[PDB]
Amino acid sequence: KIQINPYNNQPFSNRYWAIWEKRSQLPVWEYKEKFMELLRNNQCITLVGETGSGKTTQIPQWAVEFMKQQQQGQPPGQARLVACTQPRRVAAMSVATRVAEEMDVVLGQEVGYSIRFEDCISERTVLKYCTDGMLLREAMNSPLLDKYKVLILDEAHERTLATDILMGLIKEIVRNRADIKVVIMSATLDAGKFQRYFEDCPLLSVPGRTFPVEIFFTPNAEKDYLEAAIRTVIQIHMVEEVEGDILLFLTGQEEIEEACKRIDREIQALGADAGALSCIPLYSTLPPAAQQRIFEPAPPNRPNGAISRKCVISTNIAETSLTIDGVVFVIDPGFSKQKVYNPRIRVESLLVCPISKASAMQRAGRAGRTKPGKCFRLYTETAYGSEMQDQTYPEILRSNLGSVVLQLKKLGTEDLVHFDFMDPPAPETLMRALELLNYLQAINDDGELTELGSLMAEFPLDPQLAKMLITSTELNCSNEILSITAMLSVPQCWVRPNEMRTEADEAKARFAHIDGDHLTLLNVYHSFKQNQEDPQWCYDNFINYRTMKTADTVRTQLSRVMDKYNLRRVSTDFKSRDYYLNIRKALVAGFFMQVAHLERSGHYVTVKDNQLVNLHPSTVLDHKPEWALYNEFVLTTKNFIRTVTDVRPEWLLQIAPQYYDLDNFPDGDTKRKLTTVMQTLQ
Amino acid sequence: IAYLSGVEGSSKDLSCFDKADVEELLIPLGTQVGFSGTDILLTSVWPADIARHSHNQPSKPQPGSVLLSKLAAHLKPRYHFAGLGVHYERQPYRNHRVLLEPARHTTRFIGLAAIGNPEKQKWLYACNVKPMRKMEKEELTAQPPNASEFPYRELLEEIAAKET
């Protein structure tokens, strides 16, 4: 029966009916009439539903009709939108493409998405997908989110810094703009903390997994998990008669590249009887071609009936948003690396830490997408209940708040110490944040955003970097500095397959500038530009082609940003004595707090906090510079300062006058060196 | 087929069975026509709690027979029909630990209801079998999708600890 599409006046196309049948069978569908009533009755809703419950695709579409019905019989009023946020760029796209099909309209027209570096809207857009940061990016110009009627903060469980900020402001919005609906969705079953936070808003629970999963435990507690994991993989390969791939969760590349090798050894021992096992590493910095393996199908198996299998060994990248098809065996050792930023010593850590009562589920939930499946945890069930905490900390309780305080100040939060965070940041961290901003001239001593500060918020950057870049425009080096900004705002472009480490390091040496990693990246960026951006040249020189193409994009965006505020892009003459001098000075302008000096003991100690550090062995330095500017204080096996740079102490006193003011300093070696320099300059 | 009638008890009444009855039922452990075990099992009462590790649960928290667990616990029967109390298709279960030892044929237990039960219809179960004298391992034992771990594994270790 001919229904007309209300959006384009078309008959609904022949494709839609078939899709319609399948989507009617999604679990959320029965709730359709029930949801609308709640939305009509309340301003805030909390919604919960397991993976595969169809929330993300059906709920925003049902929001759209509810907008339309509210326009029916009113005049056609000012164009308002329904927003759906999505924590990751890849998800914001993959939803929209499906949802532009379901509503039988052309993507970007009535149904769109708005992610970084690509806007797919039109003036007929009603339903806008965006990453979380973009809905944070819009508010900073329009605090009441003025274009929006129904918001939808999806995947709330991920608790990302974009999302935690939003929620608080959006509850603030729920005051004031007293017409805007909010529908907070979470995919995890979470203990209704969302329900409290938003004034006891109604909680809607929707079930909906695809298949059931079997959970398993070791009865005793194995003492060497990698030996256990490797041993577990072999055991499964040999005993399980069901076809399927094994997805093993490890901590990182030092292990996922070991585990591949050692598992290859034992399958080479098991010889002709056992089926072929193919071991595929998978971590977030593998180049595109190495990632693409995961789509590869299994062998046709050996003739004797021995099942051949693919074994994907992966960090938490396989837990969320990456959907590995064909998995029917998940091995979960129960660890992940967790950043935790220790605001007392500015040591940002990367230790192996136990997963949470949620994360355990999500790892197991990979099985049960295509057929029933089994999850093997290498820990004991009593271990599960009593050591793993119930959910993993939000991002906000874990990271440096420099980027966030500046965003909140631009949004016109003055009252940060009462800001309504769902899980508030530590007092000690915020005191680093304000202290970070106060040196940087972002905020005056009475805490208002200064003129320089308001410009610093406009850049998609961290506060230190923005101070560098702005200051680079008065040193006549902004074109060179713009690139050293772009490369440091993307995940690091060095590739090092451990099967090829020596050859890859040789490529790194050829790029290496003498004065440290910051000029080494500018050399890397220029070399990529000279070679017409040819993917091959990225490969043989062990540079991720994703990072550079992302990086060059970031640079173009920052140029556009500079132009809108009349920061002239300039260069010093390459012929000039000042060219590599003006680059290093600009760095020092903005990472002036994060500077080390070489004490007589042969170790570095970081300026003022006396924290003992070593050059991170990836540095292309071949010397210990006496004063070292560094971008990231890392805990792994030791404190390591990464991305290390030689600076000259005269720059420190001239360029960054506030912090290196001698009279404040803790009395020690750092002060002794600095004092002599100031007397010399005078 | 194998069968044991009655309720677990120590009385010499025809309506009760005991350890000795289960044992002399269990007596033919040698391979009498190659005989490994039976296709079907007919009992009155439930075993010691089918509901453990089951992907569904029965409508009532049934207790049941420790002993008949033991007879299943080596009979490993393709099917187990249990009378009394409640319908219940329990989903399957395996007959070993998983990953430790080769695959072996899975049981399915099927609870039937009384005629004229206050729910009506379900009490009659209409079904195929095919035998373990003509079936073969590549058909008989390939683990059918919904397979669970062995429900009397834990209790066997407990019940052995005193009794055997």
């Binding site: 005793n220 093997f376 | 569904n56 379900k122």
Partner: peptide, 23 residues
């Protein structure tokens, strides 16, 4: 080698399964 042990979560207090495929 590694010792398996189970602990599975209940789905529903219910009453059907495999038999259509078991038949």
């Amino acid at each position: 080698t590694q010792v398996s042990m189970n602990k599975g979560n209940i789905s529903f207090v219910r009453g059907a399964g495999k038999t259509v495929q078991q038949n």
